[PDB]
């Protein structure tokens, strides 16, 4: 009968006569509540046995006491918020100091020296991002600092930004206040250049999504037509590398539309045309890509990028006779060829045995078992077993439902 200890936590078997017990469905163990008992705690509000006494005093202290604030304090805190301009100036100062004191990488021979970790740059980066409403990529900053030329092209831009802000210029804040028209200022241009450098570092690292986000923020900041064209071209290239063909095409079209507002010396228009053509090629519309390349050549004859893309399209056209036509409209996008696409598939791909349409199905905001999926009444669906609720037969078949 009795083999182990008398306590419920004992392992081996017991008997009703010797050690009578209550029906405890599931209770914690000697080492504290487990994930299952904690799931019961969060869902039912108490452990499944019910003999336990709920005690969430610590949770109450963490949430409700912390978020409680009287009306007067809540009203005066907004008025006593810090000074945005001074806070931004201090953030820029400390960020520049940290970047300057960041050590330079030793160029070892025979192997690649590990780039020193950026511990002290995060907090200055966090405050700078908060102040400017922008989001800087830590990977991009790491790559920029590791590269020597990019490091200088970032430090000079940051110093110019600091100088122009200290001189009393806050272009975003002034524009927002006025809106509550003019062209880009020196401070805004320096900020855009800094963000473009960060995006270039992101591209060198391989973080095309971060590069695209940084360039999008730079575009948001910019207002000059030339800056808009250049930023649109950069965003188109970043989206092409990130496997965002719709975004790349949209940015390229916007750059090509802004073409007239830009002076002849700039190449942003040609870059936008190249990006649009590349997006079309990746979407597998070779006729559209060729037409766009022809238009770009007619606009800027002799552009190196346009010539290279035209040569590549000519090679693809020479290969096409093997197929006797273009890719059929049926698929028109099926093939995937980018490392960004491969990484996305590896991350968000439906794994075998989990994260698939048979493991869990995500409803509006909730997880459901495959049987309860409202997107299909398959043979494993509960919806199949319902039928003829009482209104009408609703189906000709007479065996189930």
């Amino acid at each position: 009968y009795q083999r182990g200890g008398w306590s419920p936590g004992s392992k081996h078997q017991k008997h009703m006569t010797l050690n009578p017990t209550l029906y405890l469905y599931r209770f914690p163990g000697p080492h504290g509540p487990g994930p299952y008992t904690m799931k019961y705690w969060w869902t039912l509000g108490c452990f499944p046995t019910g003999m336990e006494v709920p005690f969430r005093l610590h949770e109450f202290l963490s949430t409700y006491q912390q978020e409680h604030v009287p009306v007067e304090v809540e009203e005066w805190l907004r008025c006593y918020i810090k000074d945005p301009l001074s806070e931004l100036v201090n953030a820029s100062n400390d960020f520049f100091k940290a970047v300057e004191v960041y050590p330079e990488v030793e160029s070892a021979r025979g192997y690649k020296t590990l780039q020193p970790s950026i511990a002290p740059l995060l907090v200055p980066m966090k405050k700078f991002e908060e102040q400017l409403g922008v989001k800087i990529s830590p990977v991009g900053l790491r790559s920029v600092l590791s590269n020597p030329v990019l490091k200088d092209r970032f430090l000079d831009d940051l110093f110019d930004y600091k100088s122009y802000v200290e001189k009393g210029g806050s272009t975003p804040h002034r524009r927002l206040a006025r809106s509550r028209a003019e062209t880009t200022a020196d401070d805004e241009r320096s900020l855009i250049l800094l963000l473009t450098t960060i995006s270039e570092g992101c591209i060198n690292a391989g973080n095309y999504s971060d590069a695209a986000s940084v360039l999008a923020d730079a575009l948001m900041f910019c207002h000059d037509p030339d800056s808009q064209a250049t930023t649109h071209a950069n965003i188109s290239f970043a989206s092409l590398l990130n496997a965002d063909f719709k975004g790349a095409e949209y940015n390229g079209r916007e750059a090509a539309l802004l073409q007239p507002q830009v002076k002849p010396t700039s190449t942003a228009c040609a870059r936008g045309y190249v990006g649009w053509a590349a997006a079309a090629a990746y979407q597998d519309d070779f006729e559209k890509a060729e037409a766009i390349v022809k238009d770009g050549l007619t606009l800027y004859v002799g552009n190196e990028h346009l010539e290279k893309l035209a040569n590549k399209l000519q090679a693809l056209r020479e290969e096409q006779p093997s197929v006797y036509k273009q890719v059929p409209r049926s698929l028109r996008e099926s093939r995937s060829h980018l490392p960004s696409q491969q990484s996305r598939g590896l991350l968000s791909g439906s794994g075998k045995g989990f994260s698939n349409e048979f493991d869990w199905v995500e409803f509006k905001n909730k997880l459901y078992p495959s049987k309860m999926d409202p997107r299909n009444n398959e043979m494993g669906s509960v919806f199949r077993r319902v039928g003829d609720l009482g209104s009408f037969i609703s189906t000709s078949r007479s065996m189930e439902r």
Partner: peptide, 9 residues
């Protein structure tokens, strides 16, 4: 002029 406060007084 009123707000939803967790506790009062």
């Amino acid at each position: 002029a009123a707000a939803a406060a967790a506790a009062a007084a």
